[PDB]
């Protein structure tokens, strides 16, 4: 499912997201945007590491969740990979939690460091009742 910008904003404060760990929701809206553009099919196959980022937080394979195809790889959220590509994104919420609870948090995705910190995001959430 490809989201809507303050559709996904209410969806993830729902899911308890808002402030969870100290993140804001504009920050988690900057995250997924930059993920995957809102997508929770969207893949990433890493050819050098030979492992994948899954659905609207890309989250890899070689760490959080099993796919059963990657070497050497752990699964720290206990998911399948394959509850990444839901349309429904209870369980990507559950487990970009259980990654922000590690000592980097919110900062574990590069990405995020490149496109949301220290920026201005409030623009994410402004207009979605939030």
């Not at 402030?19 to 945007?33: D, E």
């Not at 796919?67 to 590509?85: E, F, I, M, Q, Y």
Request: aromatic share 10%; proline share 2%; hydrophobic share 35%.
């Amino acid at each position: 499912k490809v989201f809507e910008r303050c559709e996904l904003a209410r969806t993830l404060k729902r899911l308890g997201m808002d402030g969870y760990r100290g993140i804001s929701l504009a920050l988690w809206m900057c995250l997924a945007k930059w993920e995957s553009g809102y997508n929770t099919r969207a893949t990433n196959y890493n050819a050098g590491d030979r492992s994948t980022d899954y659905g609207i937080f890309q989250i890899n394979s070689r760490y959080w969740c099993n796919d059963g195809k990657t070497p050497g790889a752990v699964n720290a959220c206990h998911l399948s990979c394959s509850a990444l590509l839901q349309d429904n994104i209870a369980d990507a919420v559950a487990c970009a939690k259980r990654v922000v609870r590690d000592p980097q948090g919110i900062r574990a995705w590069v990405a995020w460091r490149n496109r949301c910190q220290n920026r201005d995001v409030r623009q994410y959430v402004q207009g979605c009742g939030v």
